[model samples]
Target chain A: LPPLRLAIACDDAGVSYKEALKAHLSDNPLVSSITDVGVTSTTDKTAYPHVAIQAAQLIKDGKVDRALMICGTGLGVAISANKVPGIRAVTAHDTFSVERAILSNDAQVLCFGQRVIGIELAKRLAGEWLTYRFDQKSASAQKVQAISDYEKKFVEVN
Target chain B: LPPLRLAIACDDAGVSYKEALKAHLSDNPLVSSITDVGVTSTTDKTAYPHVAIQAAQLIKDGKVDRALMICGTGLGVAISANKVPGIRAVTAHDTFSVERAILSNDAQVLCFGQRVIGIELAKRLAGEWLTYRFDQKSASAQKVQAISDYEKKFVEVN
Candidate 1:
């Protein structure tokens, strides 16, 4: 199989980590491709939503298979991404959460809370999440099926 | 030509305005199509970004030619919608602003401050915004072009 296509995005809060991760990913010829989304510096207060939406567009447009987002708190960015249809974003700060989010939830976007996780742990979480594939035949597949069905019945209670 | 598709979405804070305006829209013959993106009676604490993103999807998917969104201040929803590619969203409270937003900005999405505008003014604003069309060769078109160019160069910050 070809290398995975990854798009990394960050707000000012996560610029340092985003750059470090991007550099590390580049050194690995083992992977397919990597693209940076936006907010390229820690000094810039450029909003994360812009990059989050752009990352979602890349997925929707078939330009990239997955995305990574960094923010002060990953919750805001994750919520922003989930608003876009076909974008399943979740924060994964640890190996277990990362593996579970991918294997169970079929999350396409991984979010990191830069204020909470250090660079080393963030790299580990990213690696674990990226390596796991959603197994449709596994028990985790049932969770995915359940969520899909639940989504259709999900109403935005005003 | 077929009727123009329209979807109304609002966060919890704007639920009452959404409900009242939707009822009014249903009675208008000029409104050929209207769908409520969120449920009536604000019970959920859903974020404004959710409403904006959903509105953008309706437009991008060709399901809706236009969308109306309501929020506490309107700024949050407007900012969120602008992040969405190909979505021109504007917030208006008066007939003039409503008309100009669509005709001048070529905005496909309309946002309003529910906390400030009552049902009567909201209905009037909606009517004006919904009825206007983009003039391809007008001065408004030139303004739209200039605005688009301005946005493109500065969307990402390094």
Candidate 2:
């Protein structure tokens, strides 16, 4: 399997953890590359949604295989990224849910909260995501396909 | 303040926890109503996306103020519900992120995982979500609005 080409971003509140994460994940042989989208400094005041959209756009454009977005609670970025059509995103913490986020939901954007989880744990979880892939032959694929199918209605109705 | 008229649902994997959760949250004085849009029995083979859209539809129709969706990992339901235009949803396990889900993101759909969290804790977190409301005057309102605004473009583009 090919290694992941990742896109990473965060809000001011999550910049430190984001900095720590990409640095750590870079050393993992599973991560082939990373694109740091923004909020590179704590002084940057970019909102979570703004950064999330940029990273998600990269995925949509096929610039990256996936994205890891961070915010104060992870809720904002996850919500914002999901608003992008064809994007499956979630804010998850535990390894079980992280595995399921990819395997069961085919979530392309994984989000984390700086205030909700430990920095080291977030890094470990991000790397954990790199270890799994969505199985199209799995039973869960139909469920994920249903989501994408229904999502298209909203896009077309407008 | 008026109590929340809550909508709840789950897949077969989460039927037991959903049964326990709605039963528990129904007792909260903060809950005005509990609508069980469910896989009610474990034998039911309905997928998580099917249930999530039903509950999210009720919200879109103004039949419910918010929803609590449960699945094996919560990610599938959360991702599915957010597919509905105008819905802001996230899978959250902690009290703080649950609070931020409401406060910062104005998240209308709160998701939980049967396998990722305890039934009692999931119920507690679901109820905890109802205690807070998005503060329109707060800085986060702008961020939430940004997501909604960007989402409209996708709807309009199609």
Report the number of the highest-lDDT candidate: 2
Model 1: colliding residue pairs:
A3-A32, A158-B42
Give the per-residue lDDT of model 2 (tens digit) for B1-158: 67989999899989999888888987899889989998889999988889999999899999999999988888889998888878888898999998888888888999988988998788778777888988889988888878877866755333
Q: Which 10 consecutive positions of candidate 1 chain A have the poorest summed lDDT?
A: A149-158
Per-residue lDDT over B1-158 for candidate 1, one digit per residue giving the tens place of the 0 to 100 score: 33577888887878888888888888776678887878466787665666677877789788888888887645446545655656666555556556656665577877777665677988888876656677799855653454344334322221
Query: Native contact fraction of candidate 2?
Result: 0.77
Which candidate ranks first by DockQ, i.e. highest? 2
The ten-residue window of minimal lDDT in model 2 chain B covers B149-158
Task: Output DockQ, candidate 1.
Answer: 0.02
Candidate 2 local lDDT, A1-158, one digit each (tens): 67989999999988889989988998999888999998889898977888999999899989999999988888888888887878889998999988988888888999999998999899889888999999999988888888877866755333
Top model number, TM-score: 2
Clashing residue pairs in all predictions, respectively, total: 2, 0
Report the CA-based lDDT of candidate 2 relative to the real structure. 0.87
